[model samples]
Target: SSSQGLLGYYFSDLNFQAPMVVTSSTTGDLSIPSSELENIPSENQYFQSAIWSGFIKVKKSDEYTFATSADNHVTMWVDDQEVINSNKIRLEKGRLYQIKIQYQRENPTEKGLDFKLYWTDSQNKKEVISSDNLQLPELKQKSSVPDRDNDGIPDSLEVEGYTVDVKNKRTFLSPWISNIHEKKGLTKYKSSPEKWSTASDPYSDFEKVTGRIDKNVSPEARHPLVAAYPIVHVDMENIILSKNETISKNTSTSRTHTSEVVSAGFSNSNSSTVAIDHSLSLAGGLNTADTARLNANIRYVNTGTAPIYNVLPTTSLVLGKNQTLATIKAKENQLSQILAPNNYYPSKNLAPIALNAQDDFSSTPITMNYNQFLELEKTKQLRLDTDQVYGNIATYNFENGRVRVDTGSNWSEVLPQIQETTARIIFNGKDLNLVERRIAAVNPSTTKPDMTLKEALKIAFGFNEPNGNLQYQGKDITEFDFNFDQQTSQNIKNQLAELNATNIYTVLDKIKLNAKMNILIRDKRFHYDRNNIAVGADESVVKEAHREVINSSTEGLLLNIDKDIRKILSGYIVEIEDTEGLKEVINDRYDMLNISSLRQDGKTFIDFKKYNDKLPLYISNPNYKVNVYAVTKENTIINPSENGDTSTNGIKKILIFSKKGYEIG
Candidate 1:
């Protein structure tokens, strides 16, 4: 296509401003030079006018369907001939086109299509320019599916952080459990040295201290043993040594250990034990009966029962120094078994005896509610809030719940049903030419119509009289388009690229960081009587709690200050749980830049490291510190006087410190 001396142009790009910068929407007459039209300023309203300059390389890869829409003028030439032209003389907008290009001309190399953009202003003046790239919109490619290998599960479904196992319909815990298992070393496990080292045989294994009557001893206690050393005992019928050894006159204590033994819930497969020096252990094979509870469960102990439980019911126990187990067993059988007061049994006096009898031992009763106890439902139906549309005086009053559309006598029916209809809103602005792909003008007769929202609204609202003074902003020129030329478009592309790499500055104001001090523990304030004096009984407890807080505040300041400094440094303006202050640092600084924390009598300071990587200057200095001083209304920075004489007040300006590197304001 021959370049028509830069006719009007409308770049089909969303990069421009909201109304979309087309080649020729401005309807004025003026032959503007392309060089003088380089930069078009765009405002920051979520739209970028710079995008019109950045050209994208698109090719019809398959026999695909194509669609195009525009608001201005557009022309395409294939091998010197004007293949398609939609240039029009109207400021009309919102012209849309869809076409199928399946197997047409197969392949055209070198210069497939030469496109031009042309536009005319409302006054019908025209401007045109050549295009840098041709944009052909097409459909997206279908994504390929991934087939799985292990147990017929798809590889996509089995991907880490997402997939689960199908066998039991349970999510695979390994991925999440690995994190917990890695920290298992932090937990302390309960272990005992005595129970794990036993051997099997009658006299070979040592009998452990299983049952105790001390109120301090919990019933879950087991004689935990290590298997490193075994107890050998006198020969038993089942005891057989892999290596035959005649005891040569009692060289060791027990020759064997009981593999099976049953005490309370403590039971073993083979029962026997060995004895030596009056001490017993397992020698041949150890029985787990005595040590089962030690490893299987946890326990707690108490020295005394509550006073409330004393009057409810009482169980008798014989107590003395190291009471014999045989005597306690006989006495234990005499006590009646009942439910423990709480979930706890008296570990010292009433030990936890595991009864092996598998009968209905639970005494808890199940409970439920009756249907008649439910409340009746409300009789009146609830009304949700709605915007009521009315066909009177064009206005929307939120308080009155009305969306009225009527200007004086020019009346239009209120389509209240439109509120209930689910429709996507389209800002179909202006239209374009069909053949030459330019903007088309609306006919005075609504026939051969190419009306847009702007044009329709102009007609609906009496904006212009049919054939009057073609005066806009006191100017009369024909055929002027606001479209971007190649050079201007390229300039916009460069500007956008620079903007993307630009560091946007965020200025902060009214910043505050304060720490409040109040006693939370057993403070004397809570014990203060109406007479404004502390009670004698509360003296010890109140003083002791304050003493603990004071002692703790010394070392705790290191951790507390560090944590608070980190909170501000992380640039989180919102206050967090347990955090002391600095909830509004509106500058939106990040916490990762926090450096150090300092504590003083009247002031606290936090150092932060600034980071803005997008700028080109690469200034080295980034660390900064903020000092929060105790301030008063009288414009004085207050802290305790060095002499500790008079309490002070009145504080003012807080100081900020910039350390190491360029000095920033």
Candidate 2:
């Protein structure tokens, strides 16, 4: 396909839109006699236009003459220089000349017309170009799949309920990542924000990168999609300077306007006729009032989460096939005992937060779908929170049907904050250094000779010092000629076991470094780079704002990390019984393995040191290589180095199925 052949596209009409009549790989020579003209495209037996474009080869570098033979008008370009009417141009053998011919046969003649394309060599000898003459040019083969945003990723893969907006560019994927990933400078944006700096130039800096920025791009569509309703887009954005704030906004938004009223008479035929349907509304004025019947629900969803109750579909209840009116009335009180939990009757808007998604407590529900129910409960968008008293809490119009009442005033409100995925540890010396001793604990100028690793970590981890000062033997713990390697990690692990600290697990998880899984969701709310930043601006006058997005990565809430995984990733640790001899294996590969792989099985779960090896079911063979996987109950494999998605689909159990079945791919 990359050899000497012209990539030809034949159109049914001159406009060159869809419904192309035929696409031919016009092979070996553009010479067709009248008898062989059957290959040309026609519409309703009338000849139509066709476009053939590809490179033409030259055996030697010199002037070349080109011409097209046909009954109807035609145009050709060689190396983007027109050679249709005036048909001579210079050519180089090594560098190809891209040739394009837009041919039209608008004449009355349809079926019997001859067409030929010929080129003369440097010697002035003319002949039709052959398979040895034409070269294939790089062109994309358009996909015929169901991608709603037309961004190439099939709609079937876009399952996580991220709302796909046609207008939002960040919600869809593009073919550019594969087609021009490194070929074009435009495709250079950081894919993950934490991996790079938001302010750096992606074209110049190593840290600057771009994940698939899209418009209607689904949430981690690369993962198995779980189709659900009310899907929201989750891509995030970030800003650069007042440069991004003012200059880019003004110029990029300048030319757009409301272009409706001015040009209606010339090209408004379609919508002008559509306006006829607008007066179809005038029928609303008739005196005869009637009921309208329509179907209510198209899909049945499981609403099992919470103490949330499941309700029958309205249409089924109305059909009343299996139930009587008395039972329907009796079941009305089924949920009657479910009273207003705390805020429904008091001081704010009476409407319950419109987050109506119900939940699923089971690992795998009957449906192949997911819900925003549990995630929505965490996203309190409508939990009226303002400093002043709530306004418009349904004002009662005294004369009419009115009794206004405020409902909620004191509901718990919490914002989803970006958690730090990585952190570090250090211990400053206390001997003779007031600056180090100023940490709140008593540090005399005692200068006891360098203490054992256990004593040093006792102070470093604040085991003995309630003041959180880092001095046990008065030497700076960090200044030890001995680096705190695996032994130090082991010693610190012992001290932290009894400490029962919270939020320190993120630090602990990083110290031995078990967090290889990219479970942390993140977003960059704004972005502007060197290629687009404005001119004549003060060097440091970049905009002063920060924001985050894409998919459900902790954007506005609904990061679907299962609480089961959360307990291991970031949970309050209580000191527990140590496993027999597994600490040795845990210390060896703890940093090299994933966060989920290092923890013990659910029955004896504790800190990172405890692996599933502690359980009899997972006891390892001493010399065998084992492969571990976190497979969901639904049969989705969320691996350690998973394929794009986090373990959002939820895990059923930890599986170790590999010992020697090592397929590197």
Candidate 3:
């Protein structure tokens, strides 16, 4: 196995593709060994290809040139460098260069598929690269298991679900040739070592199978709030006034009178004799005979101090004392009534004028009886008037002024307006002055833009923008403050971890039938910083692969070595493709090895994506400490070793197994 000549081969019907199926039995070559066109198989079934892979031994140190040419296409690589592709290139001597030469025939019925190889030494003299020193590269001892098919199941352990195709040297899942049995409890079928197959279990050979999920499968898959709903707030204010008027009429009249009396002490008596002409005349004449009579009388009382006038004599004038009586023929009714002598008529007493109390000498007082004045009836007329004015009447107004309310107006038609105004207010933050400005702006004024009650109403309901998008001002009140602090971040991380645990467990549960209890350590914390973004381990790819194998396999698990983990195997370290030109090559201290051979029936089969190689990369002893740490996206490491027995297959790593398979570690 260690020493060999150049492994040369030609694949029939290759058509210039990568000759992955090439074997040592194929033909087509040049230089050291030239195969005749007639000797090749399938002469007319053309379009064949060839590849010669091995070491090219160099004898001396020099600038060696190499060349390759063919009828259709040919290429050659010396020491991992393309030296020739229908051309020539120089190589260094005195060292073994891993060379690979390829050739392809493009057409069928082509007479020949010719190829040639040439090399030149430092002397500039060129010749063919001979097969004398060429040989196969020596094989190295395996530090890890070989999964030639890239399947997680190795070739050594014989299992029911996994089958190795000797011809291709590849392992696959459940490639059965026949199914004779058909019973409920069977492997091939009859309740014994029986097996059953159904229409859904049709056998069809397939190429490499894998699993993938779209990057879009994230939390945003959940729906968002349908519509921007309005917040409810109600307040109210009011005023009222009332008034009355009155009229009245009033009248009043009053009267008053007073009298007094006086007396004189001096007593004087005076008597006066006065001659006066007195005349009497009858005013009317009677038709039958009429008589007239007159009488004059005077009386005096004298109290004199000195000479009492003789005339003092109270002059009593009695003009006609005599009475005349005459009877004439009267009308029958009147005369007959007066004829009786016994019924005589008496004379009436009368006086024309009278004087009393006379005083002699100088001062004399005379008294006359003015009976006419006494006979007159007393009469009085009185009038009263007034001018007055009451105080001015006062009035007041009110508007339900005493009523208090917590109320609001309906805004079905103007909701958009309210939203706009509310947005404007919130956009202004907690600026009270700005709020005041807006409030004042609600009314039309001389110095500012005019605003109507409708506009003000819009603002009242929290709409303050042309568009009705609500503003995200810091002052906006909600049921809770949505500010995210470090504490909140931690909380989110915890919840996300819990969610991830559920996700992982659910996925594993689906694959549980094919495997066993498996421990999964995960970190969910995420940190964002100015210069860095923390990234956590994502084993979804591995878990997804398990799901694929579990769902598709008919019997036991026939898992594949996930490509993500495969590239990190021994001598196959994965490096970032974008590595800058740093001279020092960095290596991964932790590596995943192919531990397929360690798996056994009923024992733990490590279905590790990375830890398999990782265990071997560091462990020098079987009992070496498996230091497992779950690092969060924030780079926080949690030590699960402190809480549980880390050595248990259920704790440190995934415990996977099959119904069959033997261990050979």
Candidate 4:
């Protein structure tokens, strides 16, 4: 009841990293010999051809909206027809949007592609978007429902029968793509290399173009047809420069090292106490002299695109109970094969191999409570969970104590099988032990099998580590074009209110009174006006201001004394360390009120004398500015009324704008 309902809507404009398809393939980067411009296709080693293939999903046929922003220019096509044709042109990097064509989705082939885009950038370079390599971020809410066909691979990758090699900083599928030509054995198809060399930012004469340089000519001039198309074009502007590279320099990394050690005493230091338990180590000291109790087998089931049902779970033979441990898994393989495939709800076509190791099948029913079961599930993450199952029985490392089942198909056949969720399997208790043994083998059949708690979480969720492993470093970039008449959005808002039988004022009334309007955020972080930027310095700091926070925090409550505000503001103590100049700072608002009692003891703080308080001073600092942010346990907005009562928790943190400065401590 005491919590303020605060909801933060953080929106980030999506940028993308190109995968292999367009970067390595001949068609990925289309190189034209100026010699073939007249005739087009010529048989020469230097003449390269490729298309950028990207795909967007449509539940059905519809006129989907799309926007593109490139350094150069590009023409986009939907289905087989051109939808947007800003062909061979360059535009200032900004938002360029238009109505796109209706995407006519054909029936489901195991896979089909569209999203035709072939364009040249400012550098005169040309490339196509590979539908196969498309990386479209899904704009949807996070789902709590089980997503079994665990394609959203967490930490560990399960490609084919292999585990992801986290050490290599690559997934189990180093690069996942199918060669359309190679799969069909069609000579008419062209191939692309798997990877491309990093691009260098070649200088340009565009800076000297004092006259009008048409955007159209910019693309063709920069990316000369000779070397244009690249699946992944790295922008120097988007990349960190060499000077920005992190350096340790002459700083001593061995500051704590000792040249000579009083060994035992040093080792006996309290800090040397080991934090881990050996029972947690699974009990070491297994010698070859003892009989090996552990046993395992691998079955690489290769099911075609045909769908199967009721692929038995490990419990089918062991526990003999109908438990949907379907969402739970014991190993990466079972997680991927059994659970992950189940989530996609594929319509048809799959082949899965059931694992059955007689020696390892504990044959004993294991008991587990909710927490233990949860821990088990958490440790052995699941990748995919499809509704369908796979049907193809094969076993490996069989009777010989070292055997594995193989999918008897070549790369082409295997590629499609792997691409689609056409495989499923059950890993019984024995199955898990066997998997562990394989992971421990001298020449382990299953590589990249170190399953730490973190690794397990990632595998279960199919989450690859973020490229830049930064945490909670939130980013906010918003662009508002409020200039457009609100006829459209206002109409929609009215429609929504009408549908809900509610009042526009009801929604408007829910908004908190403009208390914090006294302060505003001076985001001089980007080039805004005539301010000159100094080399190797943050110019934003030089131009930033934040007087609004002080005024708003003071007067906003008077105007918006609502229940929501009271809840969050209840017992909200403002810590102050000084009061000598505080009374003088408020003189402008309070009409020369003298210091009645200077209390550093508690509650209210001051902003300025001519800068008395620290709050206002911090905001007005020439090198740094103050920013105010708040969190609420309940997601809500706080609105106030004249009766001094809060209608709801409507506003959590609003930037107030003011010209005066205040101090804070």
Scanning candidate 4 in windows of ten residues, the lowest lDDT window is 269-278
Ranking by lDDT: 2, 3, 4, 1
Task: For model 1, state the Cα shift of residue 506 in Å.
Answer: 27
Per-residue C-alpha lDDT of model 1 across residues 1-665, encoded as one tens digit per residue: 11111112112123221221112111112122222221222221112111111111212211111112222222233222332323222111222122111111112231111232443333544444222222222111113412121111112212321111111211111111234333542111111111121111000011112111112211211111111111111111111111111111111111111111211111101111211111011211113221110000111111111111111111111112221111111122232331121123233354333211134344221111221111100100011111111112222221121323325311112122111111111111111100000111222221112323222222212123245432122322121112122332343345446556331111001111011100011111222122111112222332232221111110111223222122112111111111232222211222122222345542323222222222222222233222222111122211234454222221122222211222222
Per-model RMSD to reference? 39.5, 33.2, 66.2, 31.1
Which is superior by TM-score, 1 or 3?
A: 3
In the range 1-665, model 2's lDDT, one tens digit per residue, is 22236644433355443222222234434432234322223332243565676677766788877776752377888878888746568887777677778776555354532567777766879877776667544331223523243222223222211111111111112222333334333321112112121111111011001121111212211111111011000100111111100101000100001112221011100000000000011111111232211111111111110111212212111111122111011122143222221111111333221111134232211110112211211221111011111111121121121223223211111000001121112222221110100001111221111222233234223324334443344423232322223433444465456665433322332222211001110011111121111111111211110011011110011122323233222111111112342222331221122323122322212223333233322223333333233222122221322344332233333332222212211
Give the top-scoring candidate (lDDT).
Answer: 2
lDDT of 4 by residue, 1-665 (tens): 11001101100111111111111111222222233222111111121111233233322232232333331233445444464533332223222222122222223231212223343444554446332323222211133501122112211112211111111211111122234323532211110111010011111111101111112122321211001111100000010001110111110000010112211011100000000000111111122232211111112211111111223222111111223222211332233432221122111243322222244454332233444333322322111122222322221110111112234412223223222211111111111100100000011112122222222212221213365321111321111011101232344355446557353322321211110011011112322111111111122222132222222333221122222122221111121222232311222211111111123432232223222332333333322223322222122222223455432223332232222325222
Cα lDDT listed for each candidate: 0.19, 0.27, 0.25, 0.21
Q: Judged by lDDT against the true structure, how good is candidate 3? A: 0.25
- Give per-model TM-scores: 0.12, 0.23, 0.20, 0.15
Top candidate (TM-score): 2
lDDT score for residue 570 of model 4: 11
Between prediction 3 and prediction 4, the one with superior TM-score is 3
Name model 1 segments beyond 4 Å from true: 1-559, 564-665
- Candidate 1 lDDT (Cα, 0 to 1): 0.19
**In model 4, which runs have C-alpha deviations exceeding 4 angstroms?**
1-573, 576-665
Worst 10 residues of 1 by lDDT: 375-384
Number of clashes found in candidate 1:
102
